[PDB]
Structures are given as C-alpha cells and as structure tokens.
Amino acid sequence: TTLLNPYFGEFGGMYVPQILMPALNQLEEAFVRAQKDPEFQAQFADLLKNYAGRPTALTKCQNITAGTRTTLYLKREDLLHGGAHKTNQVLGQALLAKRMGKSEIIAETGAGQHGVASALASALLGLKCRIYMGAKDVERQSPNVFRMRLMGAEVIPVHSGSATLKDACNEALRDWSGSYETAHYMLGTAAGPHPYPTIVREFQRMIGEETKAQILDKEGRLPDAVIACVGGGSNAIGMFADFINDTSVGLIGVEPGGHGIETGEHGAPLKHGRVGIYFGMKAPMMQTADGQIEESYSISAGLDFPSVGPQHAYLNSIGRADYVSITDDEALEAFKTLCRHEGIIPALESSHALAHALKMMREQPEKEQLLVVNLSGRGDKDIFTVHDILKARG
Amino acid sequence: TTLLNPYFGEFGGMYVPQILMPALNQLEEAFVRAQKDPEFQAQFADLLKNYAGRPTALTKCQNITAGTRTTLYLKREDLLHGGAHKTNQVLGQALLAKRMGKSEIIAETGAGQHGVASALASALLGLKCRIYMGAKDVERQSPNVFRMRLMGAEVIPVHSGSATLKDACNEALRDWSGSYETAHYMLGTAAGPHPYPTIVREFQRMIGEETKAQILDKEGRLPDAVIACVGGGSNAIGMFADFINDTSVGLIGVEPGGHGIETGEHGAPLKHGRVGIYFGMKAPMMQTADGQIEESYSISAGLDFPSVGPQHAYLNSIGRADYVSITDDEALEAFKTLCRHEGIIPALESSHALAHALKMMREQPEKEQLLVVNLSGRGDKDIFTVHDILKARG
Amino acid sequence: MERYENLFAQLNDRREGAFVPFVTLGDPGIEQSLKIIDTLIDAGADALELGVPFSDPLADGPTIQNANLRAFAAGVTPAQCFEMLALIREKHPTIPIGLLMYANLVFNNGIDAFYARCEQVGVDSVLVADVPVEESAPFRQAALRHNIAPIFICPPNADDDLLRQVASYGRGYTYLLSHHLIEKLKEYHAAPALQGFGISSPEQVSAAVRAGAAGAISGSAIVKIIEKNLASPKQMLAELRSFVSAMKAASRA
Amino acid sequence: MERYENLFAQLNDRREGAFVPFVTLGDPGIEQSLKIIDTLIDAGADALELGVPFSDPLADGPTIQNANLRAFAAGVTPAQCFEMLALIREKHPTIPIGLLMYANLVFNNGIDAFYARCEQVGVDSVLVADVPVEESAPFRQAALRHNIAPIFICPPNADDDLLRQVASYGRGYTYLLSHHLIEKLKEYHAAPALQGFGISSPEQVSAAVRAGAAGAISGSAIVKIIEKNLASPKQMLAELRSFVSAMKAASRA
C-alpha cells in the first residue's frame, strides 16, 4: 500500500524488483512528511531564493512577435543557478535525502546536465555524490564530466548495454538497492517509479506558480497557453502544474521530432511510441515490435529520454494537455531567432518549445494570443553543436 | 568645460584628439539628463529586472568558512543574464545611445565578454552593433566570437599593433570619431575618458546598493569589508560606490598578480605600475621606462587591462580603498575551492577576489569578520583553461 | 505448476533438495544453448530457470548482463526463445521449466497472450523480475488462468505482511533471496522455497537444504562457465556437466 | 617658434604657401630616415612635422600605423629620436621642425623635462595628438617656457569658443583639419593656418593656399612612397624628391 496514488490513470506505478520497494516506500513517507513540515518548506525556499536565484524573471519578447497579434513571454529558468530548471528539484531531493538521515547521493545522467545539478546540490549540502554515466555520453560530454568532478562528485562510466542513459539508469538502481539505508537515488526527471513523478513535479511547480503570479501582474489575466519541451517531463510538468485547474489555459508539451517523425529517428514516445513497462513505470516508450527498448534521437541530448513521465501520458489521454513535436531544423531556427532578436541564447531543448510557439504565431499571425514558453535552460552549452551544423551546411 | 568633474584627484581627464571632444560632451550631457529623468530610470530598472534578472542573490557561504570566525557572502553577479556583471552597464549605455537618437553601437573587446554583452544588449534594443577585437583574441576566443555573431553583431578583427585589446580600443575610437552622430561607443569598463568612468560606475552601482540592503536584512549591519577583482574597475566600483561614505566598510580591490609581481608578468598597474596618459585618461599603467604601453598578464583574460579606472587610483591615493594582488595559482585554488565546497563555479576573474577573502580568513582564523566578495561572473567559460593547467601538472 | 508439485513430492520422498540452474536462452547461440540445457538436465538439474534476452536487465549483475548481450549478438528474439522452449519441453516431459522475465516482454503483446503462449509451449512458472507483489495482480491472475505458477521474490528482510502476501499469491516455489523466513513461509503454507543469489558451491546447496529450503538456484556460476569457454564448445559442456553434478550431489541425503 | 615666424614672413613676401611633409622618425631605419629627411628638405620642404614612434597611435591611419611598426622593428626609441633631431637641426639651421607626439611620451619623464629637451635639440613646435585644448594647460605652459610653439588642431566643425581658444593658445601655426574657419582664425589673430589630412596632390596644395591657408601638410602620401619602396632605398629617395618638388611647386605664386 502507499500514502499517495502511484498512478495517473493507467500510467505510472512502481515496477521495480521487490528489493527496492522499501526504498520507494521510505521515500514516499519522507516526502509526505516534508510537504506538511513548515521548516522543510522554509529551508527549501531559502535555498531556492538565496542560492539558486528564485524567483526567475518572466521576460516579454516584443521583437520576435512584431507584426503579429501574439504576445510572448519567456519564463527564465535559464537564469537559474546552473543554467537550467533541473536545479530546483535536485535541491529539494537533496533536502529529502538529509531528512531521511542519508549522507550519500546516487545519480544518473545522459547529457550530463542532471549530473552537474546533482553534483552542485551535493557539494552545497555536504552529501557524497556518485554519478553513473554511459561511457558513450562520458566521451561526448567532456565539459560536464569535468564540472561534476570539480564539484567533488565521483563519476562512474557505464559500458553495459548501449552505454547510454538508460544503461546508466539501470546501474544507479542496482547500487541503490544495496545502499538505500545511507544513500538516496536522485532521479532526474518526472518519470520512473512512484513517488518520483510526483516528487519531481512538486519540486518544480514553483515554475508555474511564479509564472501565474507574474503574468497576472503584467497582463492582468492568465495565458491562453503555456508551452514547454518534453524530454522526461520535469520542466513541463513544473510549468503545467499550477495551471491544470485553470481550464482556459492550454498546456502544450513539445517532444523532439528529430529528423522527422516519419524517419523513425525522433524522441516522441508520447504521441508516436507505444505503452510499455520500463524504468519502473507503465508509460509510452520507444520500443521494437518485440518489446525491446530503443533510443530517442534528437539534436538536443537533453531530450533523448526514450519514454515520458506518466502524468503527461495521462493529461494527454484525458485531453487536458496537448502534445506536439518539433524537428531538429525547427529547433535550430528558433535557437538562431531568439539569439538575434532578443539577445538570449536558449538551450536546444528549450528551443523546441520556442519553435512551436513561433509556429503558433506564424501560422495564424492575426490570431490574438498570449503565450508563455518555459525557457528551461541557457544554450551556451550548445554553441559547438550549432556551429558544427551550420558550418557543415556552409 | 564640462557639467561634471572629469577628475578624481589627479586621475582621469579627457585625453582624446580634439575631434572626439564633441562626442564626449554630447554623451556627458545626455547622461546628466538621463539621470534626472524618471522615465529613463524606470526603463533601465525594467530591463534590469525583467530581462537581466535583478536583483541578484547574496549567498552566504557556510561551508568554506567552517572552523573560522569569518562569515562570507557572495554577491551573485554570476546569476545575471550573460553570466557577468557587464550586462548591467551595457543595458544602461544602450538606453543612452537611444536617448541620443543613435541606432548603432561600437564596442571593443578582449576576452570577448564585453563583446558578448554589447551584442546581447544591441539585439534586445534594436541597435546595429559592430565589435572590434584583436586578431590574437579572435583566434583565442572562438566561442565568444560565435556568440557575438549569433546575436547579429558584426565582429571586426584587428591586426594593428600587438593585435590585442588596447589595439581594439584604438580602432573603435577611430571609427567613432567619424560616426558619433549615429553611433555610440560602448566602452566596457570604468576607465577611458570622462564621462565613461562616471557613467560605468553609475550603471553598475546597483551591485553595491543591493548588497547593502541585503546584508542589512540578513545580518543587521554593514560588512567589515567588500572585496572585488580589478581589471578595468567596473565591477569593483559598482560594488564600492554605495559604501564609499560608510567609512567603517573596507573597500578591497584585487589586481591580478599573474606569475608573481616580482616576475614582471602581472596585471597590477595600480600598485605596481606608473602613472601615464593613455586610453584617454591619466592613470597608473603598465609601461616601459620609455613610456611605451605594455600588456597585463593574468591567467584570466578578463583582467588583462594594462591600466585601471581613475577613481580606483584616487580612492587608493586617499586611503579610502586598499588594493592587493592575487597570483594565478592563488586564483586557481580559490576556483577549485568554491566549486567543491559551495557548488558554484566562479569566473577566474572573480576567483581573484575570492582568493583574497580566503587569505583574510586563513591568515587570521580567529578574527571576527563579515566579508562580501563580488562574484562578478560564472566560470563555465574557464573550464578548459583550468582543465589544461591541472592536466599539464598531472 | 503441477510439475513443481510432482517434483517436490518426489524429492521429499527421497529426502533431498532440488538443484535448479539458470541460463539465458540463446546464449551464446540457439544451438549451443539447446545443448547446454540438455547437458544441465543430463547432469542432474531438477528444474530449470530460463531467461529471455532483454535490452535492459536492471535486476541482473555483470555475468548475466553479458549473457543477454551474447544472445543478442546471435540475433536471439523472444519468438525464437518460445520455439526453443517448445522443443525443450518436447524432449523433457516432466522437468519443471520456469522463466525469468522482465515486465515489458510480458506486457508487450498483452499479458494474457504471454501466459497463454507459456502454457502452449509447456512452461510451468514465470517470475517477472520488475513486478513487485504490489503490482502483481494482472500478472498472477493471467498466470493462474493459464496454469502457470506466478513466482515471487521473498527478500531476506521481508516484513510479516510481505511474507503473508508471497505465501498467498505464489505457486510452484517461493524464490528466497540470500531460517526464520523459511519457517514463517511454511507457517503461512507458502510454495516450497528455493534459495537463489550467490549460490556457487556445493556447501551452499547443502546449507540451503539444511536451513529448511526445498532447494537452491544457481545462475551466474553456471553462466560464468559458459563465457569462459566460449572458444571451446566441447570443454564448455564438460565443465557444465561437472559443476552441475557436483551441485546436485550436495542436495542429496 | 621664431623659426615659424621667420618662415611665414619670408613666404608671404614671396606670395607663396608652405609645403610641410610628415614622416615618422626612424622609419624604416635611423640612417635611411635621416637620408629621407635630407631629401625632403633638398626637394623643397619649407618645414617638417616629425613623429616619434609610439606603441599605440590611436590618431593615425593604417599608413602611419605601419610607419611606427617599421620604426619599432628597427629598435627606434624616443632617445634615439632626439639624437636624430639634434643632428637634423645641426644640418639645417632655419627650417622649422615640429613634432607630432602622443601624451604619454611627453608626460613620461615629466612634461617640463620633455619640452626642455625639445628646446635643447632645436625643435620649434609640438603637437600632442591626444591632448585637447581642454587639457592643454600644462603642455602649452611648458612649451612656452621653453620657447616651443604649442600646436593645436582646429576641427572643420569647431564652434566659436574653440576657434577663440585655438587662436589664443596656439603659436607657430594652427593645424587646420580638412574658408569660413580660415577667415575666423585670422580675425582672432590665430597663428597662420596649415591644412592637413588627406593632402596628397598638387591641386590640393594650391587649393589650400587659395582658400587663405598659409600652407599644407602631407604625411600618408609621403609615407606611402616609403613603404612601397622599402626594397629599393635609392628609388625611394628619387620618388620622394619628385613628389615633394611637385607639391612645393603647387604652393608658389
């Protein structure tokens, strides 16, 4: 039994080996206790404000919407310490780990961003952090690996399987099953077994809460729609959460279309995958007709999660949220457009969300609409990727 | 004649060719007018808040001071849009340019940070930006050059002279002398001819103003000392300004010591240079016994200005502010220490300020002192530099 | 299910424990795997636990991880695994055959359809590694509907509620991960317990039986013999036969 | 100072303008520079404007920028420049010699000491490029104390206040950057005006004199001849002689 519902409709659950259930149950109870503890909330708020830099700005982009009836605001998570929204929830999970009396952190990472976030939170809060990363990703993300080590984290390369994220995830769990008494597994997105989808959403919901307060202050009304990219689903659910009961506000999640849905080389399991059971949850995923898990492709490494958070699959099923996809080229165009017109370099992940907002504006330029795009992170890290591509095309 | 005093004691002035005086006089008048214009102040405040992300946090660093009686706070300019304090003043200067009816911006840059800042401000405010950069720096700062171009700025390599910063400065001025009617020269530090030292200080003083309000709120008293690195002098004077009349607050500026003052390979003209006239001002500078201008060396490219702002030279002369130096190795140690103990990667420039605070703490661990270090920028940009050095030493 | 009941009844009459080896189907190839399995049986295996290659075996250590990789290098698919199972059953009518599965391979084409296929080829039990008792309802229901025993893991620290659940929901045998637990399981009338995890020597088999367990399961130790003799198929079988006969001997009275 | 007064009085009696070439001292080398200067004088130069190599000539275009670089490649220093000046004066007693300086080289070892050195070697005027009239006090005072004429630039858009200042503070000649200005300068009794910047053809020299100016200054045009004939020292002098004689001819009545 559990204190909270592990499911969002048919999606979610706790599909892990029996040996890990005590760890999940312990975590759920600690979370429930922490959420009703004023002291925990005060400490979390203090770190978010004085260390991470919250609240983040809500920037109106007047140049990019010129000539149309679209008003666009960007929620600036790119201004958060670390350069991405990931920082919010790792701070919350780090505090939960300490609440449970743990002094060690286990984390998995693909593009290396969650690894860096986990490392910085652990350094700040005095936790011993060990990070599992696929050997392939370790070689492709030399910068992030060095950042993790600079912050005192132990980085462990994973060669098993395709030597990527999913393989790093499996290795992190194996470790945790035998060390959960003293170590907490800091999952990096709103997915995986309950209670993670719920915990990550709650530790990211300040994104939407601040956005609501800021948009009401600046426009005197709610957005017609809030748009966010969806890799695993944390920044999107963080933005969506506080607006779920505001039925007039559209919730639009953007999955990576890669080279195009029809090419099969994409990362859009929610709308183009098939429900399966993996990563400890029942959710849409990239898989063969046989049931073997595949990989998600995207120009943006941060959106390469072959599945998606269960709450997103649920919100989609009941029609509360709509999900679309944006290709590598559309994301690249949005990236270049924001740089040139607003002086902000967006993460390629976030560029997918912006690209869809630009499409909403351009396709119907006379449609009056107030949109908010969650700028999940900054794109200084993507400069080389964009440069090589542009050059490769002359 | 001028509206404001061009001198700080014997330092400062307007040592430029007669042809450029009208441009300086125009700028001074526009600035004076803008400072008493509530609308200009409101627009500047709006950009700082909703675009740049002000106010920035004041972070207490408890881990790093453990075992001592030092309490250390870091003013988080690293959280400012762009990753450095430079953003504050480029936004102000961009608004001044528009106030004067100009649609073009001319900027000089060495490490490329000011170039990036000028480019982002110009992109946001619809200004045509052209940046002069020494060919040597262009080749060494490929990332920043690409960022500038991504934001629509025209980057012009300068081969004349030592093909570095000082040479880029000269070329920017030549252009301006014949285009000031439609173009504004966005100088990047609190130096150069009047009114720049004054304008840059005023457009950076929110650093100190916020710090004062934040420290009073958190500690109920003023700092025993505020510490900042000094390349040209903008982030330091920005922090110092609001505390100048608070005589109990020490003002400590940190110049780069490079390989060591005794080696001659450093960038500490204020305390180890000789007064001269160059860059349009009378101030301490790196020069031969003959009067030829030399270059400042530092592991941190951002602190390679061979001179220093005139107000700093003045504050030093009357004993209001004290200036010291920190070597490459001391700065590197501070960089590694902040990463590991606070989960913050500081710019190598800022690491010089932190290194001195660490020295104040370590040399007299039982001395009760409340210190604030201006964390002028983030250090993600220095990862490669630090990595290569560490590796080179095994 | 019935095959397990018959096996344990017979073993009890002989006062001996069961020795159950585990191997990945298709490792290192379909043909060699079939030979490996026949050798295990001829050497003394009382029952078999067989794994179907899965892309992400997050419940397996390095040895088994590599077994799956070798199987995949051989192009082994679940469909081919079921063909192998059908043949194994056709060759050996009474030996209990249990599968070690990962949830997605069971859920993929429908849970009911998976267990129906198991019944069709002659499988006796299925242990789904990543399905805790808390999520087992649809799996154990489909298993029972097709006369397949749903196997559950009993952790060494399992509380009383879990012991009662495992005792009530499981059939065939209770998978006990490596005295009190064994006695409690018998008190709640749980399926006979087989100790698994880290069993690699004869003394461990005798110890398990002495502790009250009905037998022991050994996998990594078996698979290690396979991977260390990849270049020598004949020597591989010879060493497998020697290891299994030694392990089975340790279970006899 | 006095040399300029004598020159202009003599030129006025002959109803002609002055042609004043500019070159960087030591470009491309001490010896060749001394020869270049003697050629300029023998060819018809009425006065000379000489630059002392500086590390950052932010008031000079590419041509002069490279002249300084060449001088530095030759190891030319301000001290060597003053030695050259002493010799030039020893060879030519009446030709006015003006220096084009950057403030730091004047301020370096003391402003007063610099002008004293100028007087000692026989220099007649000094134009400090980066010192506007607003900052000129200490410079023009030291200049006058040592009988050196302080030269000031008069921009083509200079307002009335600036014209009055330049007229009052300057001596020797007023440097007019390229009709109304010239008349205003004479009205305020300013030093005779010499037009400079972009003067590269005989017609420009005659035009300047026709506009009321006392003469014209040409630098880049002269220096260009130097850099294009670096590999041919002899041809360099020949072409310099031809250019200067043509330019000087254009100033005669």
Ligand SMILES: O=C(NCCOP(=O)(O)O)c1ccc(OC(F)(F)F)cc1
């Ligand atoms: O949380 C995610 N994986 C969960 C795997 O699920 P499970 O191991 O089943 O809980 C996940 C995937 C990538 C990530 O960050 C980054 F891209 F930066 F590497 C963070 C988290």
Ligand SMILES: O=C(NCCOP(=O)(O)O)c1ccc(OC(F)(F)F)cc1
């Ligand atoms: O302002 C400074 N130079 C002034 C030169 O003075 P002047 O040209 O005489 O006004 C100056 C130097 C470097 C800079 O930024 C960066 F390091 F990033 F490149 C910004 C400004």
Ligand SMILES: O=C(NCCOP(=O)(O)O)c1ccc(OC(F)(F)F)cc1
């Ligand atoms: O049967 C298998 N192991 C056999 C022997 O273990 P070993 O001898 O150590 O390889 C085996 C059975 C269940 C399993 O999933 C979970 F861990 F969740 F229970 C993993 C491996």
Ligand SMILES: O=C(NCCOP(=O)(O)O)c1ccc(OC(F)(F)F)cc1
């Ligand atoms: O005398 C020099 N130029 C000579 C001829 O100019 P050109 O013929 O075009 O090289 C000359 C004189 C003053 C000067 O400084 C400042 F610009 F501030 F006035 C720069 C160059």
Ligand SMILES: *Cc1c(COP(=O)(O)O)cnc(C)c1O
């Ligand atoms: C990690 C990352 C994402 C993808 O993860 P979600 O969990 O889907 O938010 C998106 N944007 C940025 C900048 C990221 O670093």
Ligand SMILES: *Cc1c(COP(=O)(O)O)cnc(C)c1O
């Ligand atoms: C530009 C820079 C500096 C040096 O300039 P000042 O004008 O002396 O502040 C210091 N820190 C950072 C992060 C910078 O980018």
Ligand code: NA
């Ligand atoms: Na995904």
Ligand code: NA
């Ligand atoms: Na300096």
